[PDB]
Amino acid sequence: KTAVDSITQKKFLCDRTLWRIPFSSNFMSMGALTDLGQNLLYANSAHALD
Amino acid sequence: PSMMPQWSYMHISGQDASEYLSPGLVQFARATETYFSLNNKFRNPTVA
């Protein structure tokens, strides 16, 4: 009955794991050699990453 | 694409070990899977 006002907090724990961002067109795993990995725009020329 | 020598030489992309191995060693490894595992050594390519 005498409960005080409340404010919610949300967080998550995920250990023993690595965040993964697969270099693929649609993020799926269709093989070791990703389709985007062998795509011409990336196989032919050179690039820089930030 | 269709030509990148380093990949085909290192089995990154190309034929599988069931094919590029000389087809006498394939026979041997296929015969002795039970007691002397051999298929774990070589590598096979997977291409999306």
């Binding site: 269709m30 093989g31 | 034929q15 599988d16 094919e19 291409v47």
Partner: peptide, 25 residues
């Protein structure tokens, strides 16, 4: 014979469906 397949080599890689409440599995 589409070849959009994921490929495990030179070789590329049934429609099925069905499980009612009771039926074996």
């Amino acid at each position: 014979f589409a070849s959009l397949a994921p490929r495990h080599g030179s070789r590329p890689f049934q429609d099925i469906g069905t499980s009612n409440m009771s039926g074996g599995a």
